[PDB]
C-alpha cells in the first residue's frame with residue numbers, strides 16, 4: 204500500500220517533502236537514534252571472538268537493514284503520511300562517465316561531492332556543513348559531512364548492472380560459516396565480500412567520507428536510499444527464487460538464525476522476510 | 490503486585506541455586522550479552538551530542554532506564570523459569586558489618602567472592618569464576634574473566650550506609666535543571682551518586698571494582714542486576730513517600746530525558762515505567 208520509488212522518478216515536491224522530513228527527525232533527535240543503533244550493532248559480535256556482527260558480515264545483514272529502514276520509514280510517516288523512503292539505483296548511475304552529475308547529487312536533494320579545497324566537506328545541498336551536524340564513533344560532534352566519490356583504489360567505480368544480475372543468479376541465500384568467507388551465497392555476494400569490494404560494500408567505499416566506515420555511515424542521508432536499493436535487490440531475489448528461504452534456519456550463531464532476535468531489537472528475520480507483509484512495495488513490482 | 494522481589498539475605502538455598510542457574514542459561518543462549526551491549530550502547534548515546542549526559546546515565550533518565558532494563562531482564566528469567574524473580578542486594582545493611590566483603594552474597598553458591606591479587610584480581614570462586622563465565626570488553630570482544638576488587642579505592646573504600654539512603658529519601662524534588670551530573674537538590678542525582686561522589690549507587694560500583702568499576706563492562710558481573718534492583722527499590726520507596734512528586738522534566742529537557750520521550754535503545758518512555766506495581770512486580774518490604 205506504500206510505494207517505494209526510484210530517486211530519478213521523484214517529483215520536485217516529493218524530493219522536497221522527503222528532505223524536509225529528514226531534517227525534522229534530525230531536529231527532534233530521532234535521526235541520531237538510527238546512527239547509534241547502526242553503530243551499536245556493529246560491535247555486537249555473534250559470537251564474541253568471531254568477525255560476525257549483528258548487522259554485517261553475516262546472514263542477518265539483509266533482514267537487519269530491512270527492519271532498520273522499516274522503522275526509519277515509520278518515523279518518516281509519523282511526520283508526513285505521504286512520505287516514503289526512495290531507493291538509489293546506483294547500478295544505472297554507473298552508465299554515466301561521471302556519476303557525480305546525477306540528479307540524486309543535486310543541491311535540492313542530497314547535495315554534491317565533497318570540496319577538495321575544504322577537506323572534502325560537503326558544501327552543497329541541504330546536508331552541508333552548517334545546516335547538518337554529524338557525530339563520530341563515540342557519539343561526539345565531528346564537524347560536518349564528507350564525500351569523496353571514487354577516490355579509492357579498491358572502489359574507483361560503482362558496481363554495474365551486470366554485477367546485480369550475476370548476484371540474482373545465486374541459488375542459496377547464504378552458506379556456512381555465514382560470514383565474510385561464505386561462497387556461493389547471495390547474502391555474501393550482495394553485501395560485497397566476494398572478491399571485494401563489490402556491490403553494497405563497493406558503494407560505501409565509493410561515496411567515501413562517513414559512508415566509508417561502518418559506525419559513522421548513517422551520518423550521510425544517502426545511506427538510507429542506498430540500502431533501500433539493497434533491500435530491493437533482495438526483494439527481487441525472493442521473487443525469482445520463490446522456493447528459496449532464509450539461511451540459516453537455526454544452529455548458526457545466535458542472532459543470525461531465522462527465529463533469533465536481531466540486536467538491538469527483538470525483531471527476527473522471520474518477522475521481516477516478506478516486504479509486502481511489512482506494508483510496502485517497490486514501484487518496479489507494479 | 491504478583492511478583493515479589495526479595496532480599497538476598499531472605500533467600501533460601503533453593504532460590505539462590507535456581508536463580509544462578511537461570512542466569513547461566515541466559516548466558517549460554519546468548520541473551521545475557523544483549524544486556525551488556527544495550528547498557529554500553531546507551532552510555533555512548535549522548536543527549537545531546539557534546540554534553541556529558543547519556544541515555545542511561547548522568548541524567549534524569551537514569552532511574553527509568555534501569556527500571557525498564559531490569560524489567561526486560563526479569564522477563565527473560567521467567568521465559569526459562571516462571572517462578573524465578575530478581576532479588577536485590579541491600580548494600581546499606583552490609584555496611585553495618587565490620588567487613589562487608591564477608592556478606593553471604595559473596596559465597597561460592599551465589600556470586601562468588603573477591604578477586605585474586607595474584608591473577609590480576611580475577612574471580613576464582615563461585616559460579617561466575619574464570620572458566621565458568623566468559624566476559625566481553627567495550628568493543629564487544631572477549632576479555633578473559635570477571636574481576637572484583639572490594640574497597641581498594643580511596644574514594645570508595647566502604648559501602649554507603651543507611652543514613653545515606655535516608656538522607657536521599659528526604660529530598661523533595663525528583664531532579665533539577667540542568668538535569669545532569671551537576672544537578673543540586675535532586676533525588677535522582679543523589680541516588681545516582683554525583684553529589685560529593687562517588688556515593689550510593691556510584692560508590693557501590695567503585696567499591697566492587699573490576700568490570701563493575703566502569704560503565705560499559707559493568708553488566709559483566711551478575712551482581713550488577715541485584716545492585717540496581719536495590720537502586721530501583723529505593724526509588725520505589727521514594728515514590729511512595731512523595732506521591733504527588735512526579736518525574737522531571739515533563740518537557741523542555743534534552744530529547745530522551747523528558748517524561749514522554751523514548752529511552753534509547755528502546756521505545757520505552759519514563760511514563761511507561763513510572764509505576765513499578767503496574768509493571769507487574771513489588772518489593773518484599775512493601776508487604
Ligand SMILES: CC(=O)N1CCC(Cc2ccc(F)cc2)CC1
Pocket residue numbers: 259395399400401403404405407408414415416417418420
Ligand atoms: C569492502 C570493505 O572492506 N568494507 C569495509 C567497510 C564497509 C562499510 C560499511 C558501512 C556500513 C555498513 F552497514 C556496512 C559496510 C564496506 C565493506
Ligand SMILES: CC(=O)N1CCC(Cc2ccc(F)cc2)CC1
Pocket residue numbers: 546682683686687688690691692694695701702703704705707
Ligand atoms: C562516581 C564516578 O565517577 N562514577 C563513574 C563510574 C560509574 C560506574 C557505573 C557503572 C554502571 C552504571 F550503570 C553506572 C555507573 C559510577 C560513577
Ligand SMILES: [Cu+2]
Pocket residue numbers: 241258259268
Ligand atoms: Cu549497515
Ligand SMILES: [Cu+2]
Pocket residue numbers: 403407420430
Ligand atoms: Cu551499508
Ligand SMILES: [Cu+2]
Pocket residue numbers: 528545546555
Ligand atoms: Cu547503568
Ligand SMILES: [Cu+2]
Pocket residue numbers: 690694717
Ligand atoms: Cu549502575
